Structures are given as C-alpha cells and as structure tokens.
C-alpha cells in the first residue's frame, strides 16, 4: 500500500535530513512528522516545515521574516502557504496533514523553514552585513513533487 507520510528532522546545524519528497497520487492526505534533534531552544534555532510552489517561496520567506518570531515567522493567512507545521525548538515534535488535492502534477513545489535569526559571523553584537540574513531557507529547503 501507498506511503502517505514522511518523517523529517531539523537540527542545530540548519539542516533537514531530506532534500526531496515525492508524494504518491493515490494518497488522499499527506502527513509530515517534524522533529528537532539538538540542544538550542526554539527562539534561537527554531524550525518549521512549510510548503509553497517554487515560484512563491521567496515571497513567503520574506514576509515570514518580516512577521517575526511571535507569528512563527509566517505571514498570517498567507494564501501561498499550502501547509505548515508550527515552529519547534530542540526536543519538540509537530505534525501537519494536508489534502493531496491541493497539489497539481507537473507543478514544482518547495518545502523549507522560514525561521530567520540573525547570525553573529564576527563580537557579541549584530551589525553591518549580519543584518542581511536569508534565514534558514537558504540551507533548509528541498523539492516536493506529486507523481
């Protein structure tokens, strides 16, 4: 029988443990089970799993960045977000289930984390070029296809 779920880990090195999901067409719903190995708390190294079209990703990550920590780095009521987990810190889990009818075969989707802390590349402070951060999506992203 068809597999209609995937288990994903996001760690303290800003990595998911997969780069690609292929959802089976005969699944009515698909479920992502997100967990977070590591030691760092949610507010410093938090992860979510969020799904958009490839085209929409840049828009949802930017508006998520602007929305900030108290909105789970997600624009409230963002139509471009097909499905998302909540934001989790180390030691936590969360699952999201969504209808596969929300996907079209042939369309390109991306999954990613929208969390965006500033990184002190230097010092103790955040200054200069560190004020520009793409967030976790730079490294925590991958493809999702319906096949």
Work out whether 122 is an interface residue with Tb ion (CB under 5 A): yes
Q: Using DSSP bridges, classify how beta strands 29-35 and 5-9 pair: parallel, antiparallel or unpaired.
A: parallel
As annotated, the binding site for Cu cation includes 47, 113, 136, 140
Work out whether 29 is an interface residue with Tb ion (CB under 5 A): no
- Considering just the CA atoms, what is the radius of gyration of the chain in Å? 15
- The answer to whether residues 116 and 140 touch, using CB atoms and an 8 Å cutoff, is no
As annotated, the binding site includes 47, 113, 136, 140
Rounded Cα gap, residues 60 and 42, in angstroms? 20
Q: Measured from the CB atom, is 27 or 141 closer to Tb ion?
A: 27
Structure tokens at 99: 């209808």
Name which position in 77, 106, 132, 147 contacts Tb ion (CB under 5 A).
77
Q: Measured from the CB atom, is 13 or 108 closer to a copy of itself?
A: 13
Name the residues that contact Tb ion, by CB under 5 A.
5, 77, 120, 122-123, 125
């Amino acid at each position: 029988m068809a597999e209609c779920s995937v288990d994903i880990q996001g760690n303290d090195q800003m990595q998911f443990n997969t780069n690609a999901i292929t959802v089976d067409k005969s699944c009515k719903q698909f479920t992502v089970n997100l967990s977070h190995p590591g030691n760092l708390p949610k507010n410093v190294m938090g992860h979510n799993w969020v799904l958009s079209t490839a085209a929409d990703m840049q828009g949802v990550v930017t508006d998520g960045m602007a929305s900030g920590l108290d909105k789970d780095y997600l624009k409230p009521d963002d139509s471009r977000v097909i499905a998302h987990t909540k934001l989790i810190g180390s030691g936590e889990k969360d699952s999201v289930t969504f209808d596969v009818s929300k996907l079209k075969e042939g369309e390109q989707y991306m999954f990613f984390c929208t969390f965006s802390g500033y990184i002190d590349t230097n010092d103790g402070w955040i200054e200069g070029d560190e004020l520009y951060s793409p967030g976790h999506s730079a490294l925590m992203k991958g493809t999702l296809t319906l096949k």
